């Protein structure tokens, strides 16, 4: 529970080195803003993370 990521396989449905990551610069992937990440619900729709600006019809 330190960060939020969308790398889990459930997000989209539609040697074992014992060193910290900063020892291998050639394996690091930059981070995306959580509000802009591609996460899907069970049905298969893309969840909108901007609940502040949503309005009801």
């Amino acid at each position: 529970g330190l960060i939020k990521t969308a790398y889990s396989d459930s997000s989209v449905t539609s040697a074992d080195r014992a060193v910290p990551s900063y020892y291998e610069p050639q394996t690091i992937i930059p981070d995306i803003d959580p509000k802009l990440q591609w996460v899907e619900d069970g049905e298969g729709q893309v969840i909108n993370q901007f609940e502040d600006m949503l309005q009801l019809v």
């Binding site: 969308a6 790398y7 889990s8 997000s11 989209v12 930059p30 995306i32 990440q37 893309v46 909108n48």
Partner: protein
């Protein structure tokens, strides 16, 4: 009248041996069935996301990218 969402079906008449004719299938309906029918489902609103398609020339294996299982490399 060509923007309807209903399926297109053709009948088949036989004027004779080897001379078929086709007509559009159209059955009379009552106004109750049309007026009382439910509306289709409303799709969700437009939105956009982001992800990394490639880092330093290599494609990460994340859910947002295609699987390696399924023309991208010269072999001459």
């Amino acid at each position: 009248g060509y923007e309807s969402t209903r399926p297109l079906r053709y009948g088949e008449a036989s004027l004779g041996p080897g001379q078929p004719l086709f007509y559009i299938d159209d059955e009379e309906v009552d106004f109750e069935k049309v007026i009382n029918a439910p509306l289709p489902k409303v799709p969700r609103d437009m939105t956009f996301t982001a992800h990394w398609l490639a880092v330093e020339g290599v494609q990460p294996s994340i859910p947002q990218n295609p699987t390696t299982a399924e023309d991208l490399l010269p072999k001459g």
